[PDB]
Amino acid sequence: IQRTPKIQVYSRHPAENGKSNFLNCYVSGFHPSDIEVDLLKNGERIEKVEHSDLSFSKDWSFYLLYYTEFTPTEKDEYACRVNHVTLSQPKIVKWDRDM
Amino acid sequence: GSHSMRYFYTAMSRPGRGEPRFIAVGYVDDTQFVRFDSDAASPRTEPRAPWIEQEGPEYWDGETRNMKASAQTYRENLRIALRYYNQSEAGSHIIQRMYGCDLGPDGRLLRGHDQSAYDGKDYIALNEDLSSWTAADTAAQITQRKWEAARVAEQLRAYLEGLCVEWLRRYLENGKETLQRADPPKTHVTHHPISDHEATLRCWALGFYPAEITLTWQRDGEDQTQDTELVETRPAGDRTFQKWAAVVVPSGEEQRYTCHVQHEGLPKPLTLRWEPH
Amino acid sequence: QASQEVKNW
């Protein structure tokens, strides 16, 4: 009855240090709809984050896209934090330019 | 090619925290174009694609009126469900509905859909014939009998064969330069050593539309589905999509692996290899 | 254009 979300953190374009891009965090396949998603920079929350309108797939599982403008560097660490009823603790997925 | 229009409703009760929320979104194929959120200060049906903004006030005002009413209807439907299932008012519950029409390439209606769910499982659905219902449990059978006697299927059939198909052709024209244009994927393979004896081969497909795509890994011409990590197709944020498929390979065997990409925006299936050069 | 809801559950 309860479905835990799948998470994917990635950039809109192949990352290039110093060049502006978009940071994405896609949560999908979850139920119920109550979910909390944060974009992190060095472990802290990024302020002006936008997200898609709640929608769902053919199997009734929900999906949301959270995103924000960002410029990748070699020092900065980016991540996605997700809270859902199926998680005993907020789940953090670090951003890897290779995935 | 083939096109479709879908509407997705979500009604969520949240006892002791606020009135039930109603969210609704509209899609043409894989492109969202309208939205409504009853939690907004001034709940309004708003545009989410450029090609729909050209519609006049009667359109936006009528859609807003309908959704405001739809929200109240699903507020009642949530209470009725508590009755049917004998559930308390303390729990949070969700009702979902997705409905819409599928055009064939000939532009005539191919199929209509109207399905509903309760707390993530099937509740009731309009069968293909657009005249009869399929109910998942005894509670939905109550709803079925009411909708049979009230001849609801007929009002839905008329919408799916009529306005739905007409507006879909209308939308498809207003935004044909993006909606009827397929964007093939920009593809490549990447190499990532895991150790001195193993590496990950990742096959990339970026910036494609629509979302439907097939990525497979072959070794010596033999599919490797059982060893392939395939991520779920994801939005890029600019209305195109991304997907990758990876296999862990032993050093030295890389060139025995091939990536095969199928996407309707492609002239032919692609066959890729890692190009280290 | 959305469909109008004509009946309750």
Author numbering:
A (entry chain B): 1 to 99
B (entry chain A): 1 to 277
C (entry chain E): 1 to 9
What does the paper say about this structure?
The most interesting feature of these three QW9/HLA-B*5801 complex structures is that the conformation of the middle portion of the bound peptide appears varied, even between the two independent molecules in the same crystal structure. The side chain of QW9 residue E5 is fully buried inside the binding-groove, whereas residue S3 has its hydroxyl group semi-exposed. The genes coding for the heavy chain of HLA molecules are highly polymorphic, which determines differential peptide-presentation and TCR-recognition. The sequence variation between the HIV-1 “protective” allele HLA-B*5801 and the deleterious allele HLA-B*5301 is eight residues, which cluster on the α1-helical region of the heavy chain shown in red in Fig. 2B.
To begin to address the structural basis for T cell mediated control of HIV, we initiated a structural analysis of an immunodominant CD8+ T cell epitope QW9 (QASQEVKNW, p24gag residues 176–184) from HIV-1 bound to the restricting HLA class I molecule B*5801. This epitope is of particular interest because the conserved Gag protein forms the essential capsid of HIV-1, with mutations likely to impose a fitness cost. Here, we report the first crystal structures of HLA-B*5801, one of the most HIV-protective HLA molecules, loaded with QW9 and its natural variants QW9-S3T and QW9-E5D. All three structures are in a very similar crystal lattice and have two independent molecules in one asymmetric unit.
